[PDB]
Design an enzyme around this catalytic site. Structure first.
Site: not given
Ligand SMILES: Cc1cc2nc3c(=O)[nH]c(=O)nc-3n(C[C@H](O)[C@H](O)[C@H](O)COP(=O)(O)OP(=O)(O)OC[C@H]3O[C@@H](n4cnc5c(N)ncnc54)[C@H](O)[C@@H]3O)c2cc1C
Ligand SMILES: Cc1cc2nc3c(=O)[nH]c(=O)nc-3n(C[C@H](O)[C@H](O)[C@H](O)COP(=O)(O)OP(=O)(O)OC[C@H]3O[C@@H](n4cnc5c(N)ncnc54)[C@H](O)[C@@H]3O)c2cc1C
Ligand SMILES: NC(=O)C1=CN([C@@H]2O[C@H](COP(=O)(O)OP(=O)(O)OC[C@H]3O[C@@H](n4cnc5c(N)ncnc54)[C@H](OP(=O)(O)O)[C@@H]3O)[C@@H](O)[C@H]2O)C=CC1
Ligand SMILES: NC(=O)C1=CN([C@@H]2O[C@H](COP(=O)(O)OP(=O)(O)OC[C@H]3O[C@@H](n4cnc5c(N)ncnc54)[C@H](OP(=O)(O)O)[C@@H]3O)[C@@H](O)[C@H]2O)C=CC1
Lengths: 484, 484
Positions: A49, A54, A57, A191, A195, A460, A465
């Site tokens: 991590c 985590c 990255k 993944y 990335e 909004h 939304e």
């Protein structure tokens, strides 16, 4: 010496269990050992991590984003002088200096918490004890009534691909490089690969991804596809359907990687500065002599077979994270799974770890967020005749003034065809996916219905939304792009 | 001529009802008239939202943000050359050219939908008809069996403050200015004021806010305060507790505004280029001769008194948006309220408009998002003895590498003290509040419990995830700042 709780792996999961178990007033102690990467790369306490994932990255993914921020910036009246450069040195430093802030940060939290740390490549000797190799070599007699195993995993490497270990690099390296990747090839299709492939490109590097099969195998293939298309459409060279067979370092030291274009030709050769293997990770169970302790394991994935209490075959021994088989390889789950475990033991807690509908976000150039089921997994379980799907193509207000193309901004809400129509899978592909997905993952834990969505008003003007606007069904097969 | 549906106000709410009512196959027709601003500013079809608010603000708020994006950018390795300038001309153009894209955009959607548009300052003549003044002067005989009133409101002005209309400017102007505000004073302490005050400062203008009393009166005062403090802490000059009494234009045309420092002194004078009144809006009901049609009204706020079916005193006449009293002055609610109304009439629908727990977001320098109750409103309803509150102070991962201060990034989750502990109010103050809040507003519509939050896993690394981590209670009075 002896402790009433031993933790193996000073990682996101381990540390959690450790610190939380100590907060319960127990004599906790953890042993973590950062066995270097094949290319000789090492880091501090804090597991994958903090050090190789985590955090870094996201941070590099961030720097990439900032780049487009500047481009866009011009349209909003910011007379920035382009094209703005970007050096790998400045970024990396910044990032790393932070990783370290979490290095000498967990270390601090371990002291203030009555917890001892023993930097030792642990290994099982029996039921309640472990041996500890050292950067030096002095073993250490360590015993505890409860042992939690959180050793995570490490970047898997190619098999017969000669020139692999030799010149290849892993996710464990790309972050700590001292000098820019320059040109690079990413052998992977999920993944990590994507990335990493992403920000690399965002920086300005001539990045190239090499997918052997399909993208993000497992994910909602539609979304998965929409993702890559965004990358390819935005600077990421793509070699769809190719596999590595040989890498040959040449004079200038550049790498001469030869593959096979199973899509077209039958072999092709190109050369790049760096080569990144994003082909999955593997559990570091082997190096524990688990068998010589009584911990049954799994065949295929060498992970530690587990309970529902995170317990193994030895009821006083448990496993957490990338280590325990059957569990999702994330961090939150690693961490939460740790706390709960440490509470069920010395806290009088009975609540177990709920691994369903855990949300996630693929931090690619265009962030792909999701929770619950993917259209496929959905028909798979309830049948196409009993599933309803609402989707949409939106355009971030921010993407408008900046002439940033948004043909990739899609949204898909999978739920059941029969009212109230319990939503059982959400898919968001646009800016800050996690930021958007998170809230909604709560609607799932709650079983929110498509009704409660048509009943939920919107904020909004936002991107999230759009989710709460969704109405066009696939049954109806109406044009997805949104008006008004 | 005659139509079976007349809509007054080509606005976010009106248009919605209009287009949706036509989609139901009815002969719809709408009349909208953009009566210029006191400073002679006019715009196209699309109500406040498109032209002087929702869209432009956000867009300018965006440009502001981009500015900090560049600063930050340097830390991530982007050798941008600073200090980067920014001209009001380029931004404004960009923005406006987009407003127009929604100008000649609603216009398009009205044609393809069998709907006629009559640009006429409508006014009531009786039960089923209205008269129509024109830029020219030809009235028009307009009648319909159902009339929906969506006239919204307009920026309220000061009373005895001489030099107001004379030199003051309203939210309706700041957006369409042709030349930079330069120096400016914002007489207001809520939504408009602060938001406008925000980006203005973000651009680099010497902005100054003049609050007479408390900030965002109504909102969770804690959050409200945290908000301003961020602004003041980041370039926004603040005159806490002052009121305007006279503005005098001087030779160089600069404005010499004189106030009263009720906090300290008893009068002070400063001079600024522009002066913006952000003191609320007012319904444009007067100009309708409502009384001469049978539409009862409200005393204080001149809004149109309403039903629960959005109906008025004349069962075939209705009201929507900023016009109808009792309803939240937002856009989504305006829009949704429109669709539903148009479906209950010619769609055989019975579902009414749910105005509870509508989320919202104050797009200030640091976006403040929320849904449900504020701590105060909460004790107010269930009593301090029956309310539990979990809060946190987080640090965006993105705020770290960039040395962007985050002492303002707070989060507050108000729910009941008794299990499962139904959450009934969430407060997020950080980046992309709406993007984060939206999802969660679904948890409210569903009645998510604090349990389902401890059961909801996180999307690491994100800002929204912090919400789903919340555990420190105020009852316990433990230090809010988060570790690990
Ligand atoms: C590039 C990348 C990006 C990622 N991004 C995200 C993200 O955004 N969000 C997310 O949720 N997850 C992300 N992940 C995955 C996440 O980091 C892991 O799921 C998580 O770290 C697993 O936690 P863990 O505690 O099980 O093990 P780890 O964090 O892997 O820690 C195990 C530790 O134990 C040590 N160890 C191993 N064997 C021994 C031994 N025998 N003796 C002593 N010490 C030993 C290791 O060297 C290591 O320090 C990412 C992963 C990668 C590779
Ligand atoms: C600066 C600013 C920023 C905002 N930002 C947001 C935001 O981010 N999110 C959000 O949800 N809300 C926001 N709002 C509020 C939102 O725009 C309003 O709540 C919404 O527009 C109200 O919709 P409406 O249809 O009732 O009226 P309006 O949109 O105000 O439209 C009424 C229309 O009718 C016309 N009209 C009036 N009287 C007559 C007449 N007699 N004859 C003919 N035509 C007439 C008007 O001139 C106008 O064009 C913002 C408001 C401002 C001022
Ligand atoms: N939450 C998040 O944001 C992140 C989480 N993670 C976690 O870490 C894990 C590790 O990531 P990752 O390693 O990328 O993915 P796994 O999902 O670990 O790896 C799958 C990828 O490796 C490819 N692959 C496997 N073998 C080969 C081969 N011999 N040649 C070429 N490609 C090959 C796959 O191809 P195919 O599908 O064709 O077999 C696929 O593209 C993730 O699964 C996830 O649990 C990692 C990054 C981010
Ligand atoms: N969703 C969103 O992002 C947005 C929504 N809107 C909507 O539009 C509405 C209009 O915004 P706004 O006008 O800012 O707010 P109201 O909430 O309309 O106005 C309240 C503000 O005006 C101040 N005020 C009133 N009279 C005076 C006076 N004589 N001198 C000085 N200050 C005065 C108030 O002070 P006090 O409280 O002391 O009386 C307060 O600061 C909002 O309430 C909201 O419904 C607007 C912007 C954004």
């Amino acid at each position: 010496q002896s402790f009433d709780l031993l933790v193996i792996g000073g990682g996101s999961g381990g540390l959690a269990c450790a610190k939380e178990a100590a907060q319960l007033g127990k004599k906790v102690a953890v042993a973590d050992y950062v066995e270097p990467s094949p290319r000789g790369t090492k880091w501090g306490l804090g597991g994958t991590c903090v050090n190789v994932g985590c955090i870094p990255k996201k941070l590099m993914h961030q720097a990439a984003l900032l780049g487009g921020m500047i481009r866009d910036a011009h349209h909003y009246g910011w007379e920035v002088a382009q094209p703005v450069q970007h050096n790998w040195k400045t970024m990396a430093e910044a990032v790393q200096n932070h990783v370290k802030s979490l290095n000498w940060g967990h270390r601090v939290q371990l002291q203030d918490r009555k917890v001892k740390y023993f930097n030792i490549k642990a290994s099982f000797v029996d039921e309640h004890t472990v041996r500890g190799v050292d950067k030096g070599g002095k073993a250490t007699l360590l015993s505890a009534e409860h042992i939690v195993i959180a050793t995570g995993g490490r970047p898997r490497y190619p098999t017969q691909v000669k020139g692999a270990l030799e010149y290849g690099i892993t996710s464990d390296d790309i972050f700590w490089l001292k000098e820019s990747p320059g040109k690079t090839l990413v052998v992977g299709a999920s993944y990590v690969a994507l990335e990493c492939a992403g920000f690399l490109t965002g920086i300005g590097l001539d990045t190239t991804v090499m997918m052997r099969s399909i993208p993000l195998r497992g994910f909602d293939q539609q979304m998965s596809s929409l993702v890559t298309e965004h990358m390819e459409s935005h600077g990421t060279q793509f070699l769809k359907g190719c596999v590595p067979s040989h890498i040959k370092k040449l004079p200038t030291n550049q790498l001469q990687v030869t593959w096979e274009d199973h899509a077209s030709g039958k072999e092709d050769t190109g050369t790049f500065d760096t080569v990144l293997w994003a082909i999955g990770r593997v559990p570091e169970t082997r190096t524990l002599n688990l068998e010589k302790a009584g911990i049954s394991t799994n065949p295929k994935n060498q992970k530690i077979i587990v309970d529902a209490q995170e317990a193994t075959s030895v009821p006083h021994i448990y496993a957490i994270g990338d280590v325990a088989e059957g569990r999702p390889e994330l961090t939150p789950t690693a961490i939460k799974a740790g706390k709960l475990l440490a509470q069920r033991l010395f806290g009088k807690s009975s609540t177990l770890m709920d691994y369903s509908n855990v949300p996630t976000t693929v931090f690619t150039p265009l962030e792909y967020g999701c929770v619950g089921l993917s259209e496929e997994e959905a028909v798979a379980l309830h049948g196409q005749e009993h599933v309803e799907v609402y989707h949409a193509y939106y355009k971030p207000l921010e993407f408008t003034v900046a002439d940033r193309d948004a043909s990739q901004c899609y949204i898909k809400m999978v739920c059941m065809r029969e009212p109230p129509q319990l939503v059982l899978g959400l898919h968001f592909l646009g800016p800050n996916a996690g930021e958007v997905t998170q809230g909604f993952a709560l609607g799932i834990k709650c079983g929110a219905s498509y009704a409660q969505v048509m009943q939920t008003v919107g904020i909004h003007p936002t991107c999230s939304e759009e989710v709460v606007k969704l109405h066009i069904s696939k049954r109806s097969g109406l044009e997805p792009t949104v008006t008004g």
